[PDB]
């Protein structure tokens, strides 16, 4: 099954600056703002579509990871599409989770972040907890990165 959700967040950060933090600089920012995440390492690719990162974390004392794959990036349009594709951090009920994001300009030099999240389930149902766990994580990450650039614009 495929279950799709949309979220939109307003931000006061300038669109190109928010976009850069979410894309080019996320590997650097995330471990600062998500304590359990220790590092983000590129394991395949050099930046082409298909580049895979291992997001290494500890949770409840045990190191694991999720794998993150770049599906498409288009800086000129401030768009970025990625999937979570495996590792212990991806629920066993899921083939993958795909994200399609886009940063639009807002009023007064700010931004609007739009994301479309697609859960690819192995079965025909999407467990509520699986859905909610991942939505909390995703929008927490956007908010954590956004909050970082707000408090540390000179990073």
UniProtKB/Swiss-Prot annotation:
The keyword tRNA-binding does not apply. Induction: In leaves by pathogenic bacteria. Trans-zeatin 1 binds at residue 7. It holds the Pfam family Bet_v_1. The keyword DNA-binding does not apply. It comes from the Eukaryota. This is Protein LlR18A. It is found in: Cytoplasm, Cytosol. Its EC number is 3.1.27.-. Trans-zeatin 3 binds at residues 132, 135. One of its GO terms (molecular function) is protein phosphatase inhibitor activity. InterPro entries: Bet_v_I/MLP, Bet_v_I_allergen, Plant_def-hormone_signal, START-like_dom_sf. Trans-zeatin 2 binds at residues 27, 53. Ca(2+) binds at residues 31, 37. Belongs to the BetVI family. GO terms for biological process: abscisic acid-activated signaling pathway; defense response. Its main location: cytoplasm.
